[PDB]
């Protein structure tokens, strides 16, 4: 009986609960202590673990520390008080199932006891959660401390609850359902205090373990690419994996290329110009320069800022190319530079090797070099040795007639600098990449209705994401062979969506190439960090 | 133990009954206050929702405010009192099954939070519910308002209820069902009154949410459509959609077309006629007019009321036309009309273009024109340019020969107002159509029993709901995005048929086009709205 009422209850106590509020008591008087309270009487939210047919007997599944983040209201309360001291009664609700069985372990670690696969669980004091279990199994987590009291910031050294598998879950069926969700609910013991106020403009935790920065209109609303500035409106899984290194940052406060986040411009001082034919009307101007000669750039020498990393086709000839790059621009001369009024035109920019010769695509940026041909006739072509180009930063695809070609970029065709780690599908799991409609060259009326599927392209994470990662570091936010996981509801269905220590983002479709709408997505929400065996869920509308 | 014995029992109470009975004195002594009475010792009915697996863990399934409408005894005392106040108990009863899992969040939000999917009820003091529970779960709402008690009328700020998902549902089965439900029981708690009686002539709810308008008898029994006043004996359902704006009124208090709900008369003034051939002996008689010349009818200028929105199919010669609408009636001359004598005939109405010479059916009335043309020879035919038509209402449908052509009207001859809201199927749910058995010309003894199928004509919605919706307002009565959903009972089986913002019926059949006979058809019920994400059930005698 949890209910609404005056209610007798019983708030559960702990074993050392005469030594821990009488040598708390250096911080002065407890606070926030009072039994009647009623966040101090009922069980709260804190944590869902997946528990999958997949794991051995006694591997660990849940980990937590004692802190007083794991309430949201001791966490609430913990901004305004530098101290606390005492216990914290846990309870573990299963969701189960009648035809699952299988038994798991829960039990207080004592400080100064490493935490893993050689722990065992089973010989503790402990408790025992069935799969099938109505009745929640509650724990208490007594405050076993060397110190006098935990401070706020260096709480030191905290015991520790461990969920580990006590007989492994089985399914009698087969496929299908596969794993379990276990929800963990926190209540304050009766020794529960806080000591020694402070100010709450001190804080602890600013990393929010990369979370705060993933809502929800950021996919149903606002939300752009890294490669064009393009609304969000699909994902789609690629199988075998992708590299992106443009615009993609780590958890870590770094990245590996050019293009600071941002849509502003692309400006290149020195390099070479020309033209074929013998006739200097209606041609097709071709600018080229090498790889590492972009001083301007702070970041790296290999591009200017904002130049797109996708391989030149080779075209020749009055016909458009099949997919690519274009942007509206033109060409300046040096020396306090005013451009030529005679030549403003759509530019094709990219990648080649051989340039002016034979020009082939290349993947390396190590022995590349940056051209950049005009796909229309321009009345005047130039061709002094310093020269540059302006091209605006935001980009649109050529196309010879309208259709839909195919989702650009191809995994294949996309360029990587040296040292670049590479997404892999680990478990069921794959990678995902951000769609975006854009506008093209054959049809400039791409609206998303009838004449033909309208064209997608595709960007590696979302910018939000850059930009409220760029300046923050993560290096402890996220523990690697994990990632964090949010949970999109959409009209019909949810998915588990995760975000690794590398930026990539994972579904667990599987070997599906299906573009997955967010059309009907409503909200999102925050789950936590969890490991990579663990497939994210794939209840959708179908 | 709830039997009807003596009985002990308990009455749980609210946290805040103290204070919510001293302060409700305002309004006088406490009324129907009396704990041995046993519209008070029990829990009833109140409501019931589907909990699916596609659904969100999070997402919200039944919301329900502090109302004495949740009770079927303390809305029965709600009309001879103008004012409450006190508490109210709710119990869960779930359906479920052994192989079923997941839990389910109850709590009372307090007012000034919205409600929706920002909102984390997880946190909340609450209870959880399991699929598979036997014993239902309760919970108690406090009376937490910022008034001193609430108004019948205007009640003020009530908290809320609120029902999520704690842990989504899994079915290790696969498909087939995928579905549970919900009974929400309500009792009064101990703090409950009523105050400052009054007389019961004074009504709030006016709209029962479109419900009372639809009973059983409307099926099996009196009842008609909206084309031929027909009685209805099945629903056809349709994939893909359809639009219907003749005599479909929405929800609010408006339509988009001409033909008010009557079959009475079909009577127009102004307008040409033609008669084909050199010899005025034994020919059929064409008579046209534009669309927007009919001043006479005040609800819409494109047509005369009762005017047939069928699209006109082209034939000559001595050949009955397949399909259509025909039906008796006789040209009229203008200036204080008395008709001609020789001229009294079957005709066939309807929409062309390009009359009198290449006749093509139409669509769109916009651009259209009305065509009146006889099947059967008549001995004279006029040609003056003021002339006119009177036409019955009710009609018959034209065939060749006997059999059976199909149902008619097809989804893709019904002809549109611009500005018309279309079916359109969400999830596994299809709009349906509701058939009427019709005389037909190639066959007048069409006698539902042998001698080839009797031909079937389909209307919209049924006439009992245009009548009863056409007088009230509904802006409110359903909340957009949903269906209000009755349960109908067969002699073996069950359906459930929803009712949308836009008028139009649905049931959960799918992709199948075959004919439901409300032959052992029995009862029906009101349930109330459910959101276009739940699949209504469709456990037929089959």
């Known amino acids: 009986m949890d209910p609404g009422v005056v209610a007798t209850t019983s708030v559960v106590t702990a074993e050392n609960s005469s030594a821990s509020i009488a040598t708390a008591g250096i911080g002065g008087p407890p606070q926030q202590v009072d039994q009647q309270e009623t966040w101090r009487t009922n069980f709260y939210y804190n944590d869902v673990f997946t528990w999958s047919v997949a794991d051995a007997p006694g591997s660990i599944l849940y980990t937590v520390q004692h802190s007083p983040q794991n309430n949201p209201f001791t966490a609430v309360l913990s901004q305004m008080y530098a101290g606390w001291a005492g216990g914290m009664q846990f309870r573990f609700i299963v969701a189960g199932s009648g035809v699952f069985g299988g038994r798991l372990v829960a039990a207080v670690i004592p400080p100064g006891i490493e935490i893993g696969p050689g722990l065992e669980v089973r010989q503790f004091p402990h408790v025992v959660i069935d799969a099938r279990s109505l009745e929640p199994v509650t724990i208490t987590m007594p405050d076993l401390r060397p110190n006098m009291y935990h401070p706020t910031g260096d709480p030191g050294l905290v015991p520790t609850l461990v969920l580990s598998v006590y007989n492994n879950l089985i399914n009698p069926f087969g496929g299908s359902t596969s794993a379990i969700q276990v929800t963990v609910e926190t209540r304050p013991s009766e020794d529960f205090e806080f000591v020694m106020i402070r100010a709450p403009s001190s804080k602890t935790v600013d990393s929010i373990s990369p979370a705060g920065l993933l809502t929800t209109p950021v996919l149903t609303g606002v939300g752009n690419d890294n490669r064009w500035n393009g609304q969000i409106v699909g994902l789609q899984p690629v199988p075998g994996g ?7 940052w780590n958890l870590n406060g770094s990245t590996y290329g050019w293009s600071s986040p941002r849509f502003a411009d692309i400006d290149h001082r020195r390099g070479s110009a020309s033209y ?6 209606n ?3 071709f600018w080229y320069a090498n790889a590492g000669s972009a001083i301007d750039n702070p970041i790296s020498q290999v591009a200017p800022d904002g ?3 996708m391989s030149f086709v080779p075209f020749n000839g009055p016909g458009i190319p099949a997919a690519g790059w274009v942007g509206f621009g033109a060409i300046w001369n040096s020396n306090s530079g005013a451009p030529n009024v005679t030549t403003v035109q759509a530019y094709e920019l990219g990648f080649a090797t051989g340039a002016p010769g034979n020009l082939q695509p ?9 051209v950049a041909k005009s796909i229309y006739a321009v009345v ?11 091209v605006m930063a935001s980009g649109v695809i050529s196309t010879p007639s309208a259709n839909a070609i195919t989702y650009t970029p191809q995994p294949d065709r996309i360029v990587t600098t040296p040292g670049t780690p590479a997404a892999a599908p680990v478990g069921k799991n794959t990678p995902i990449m951000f769609a975006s409609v854009v506008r093209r060259t054959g049809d400039v009326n791409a609206t998303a209705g009838s004449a033909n599927g309208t064209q997608y392209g595709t960007g590696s994470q979302p910018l939000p994401v850059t930009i409220g990662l760029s300046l923050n570091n993560y290096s402890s936010a996220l523990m ?3 990632f964090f996981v949010w949970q999109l509801t959409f009209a019909s269905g949810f998915m588990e969506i995760g975000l690794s220590v590398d930026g990539y983002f994972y579904a667990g479709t599987g070997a599906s190439t299906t573009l997955i709408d967010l059309t009907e997505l409503i909200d999102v929400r925050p789950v936590g960090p969890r490991p990579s065996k663990s497939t994210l869920v794939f209840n959708l509308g179908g």
């Open 242 to 248: 992708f590299s992106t290194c443009n615009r993609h």
């Open 276 to 281: 074929p034919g013998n006739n200097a009307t």
């Open 283 to 285: 041609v097709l101007q």
């Open 307 to 309: 130049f797109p990393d």
């Open 362 to 370: 290349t993947t390396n940026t190590s022995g590349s070099q940056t």
């Open 380 to 390: 005047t072509g130039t061709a002094q040795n310093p020269a540059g180009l302006f």
């Open 480 to 482: 690697p062979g994990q």
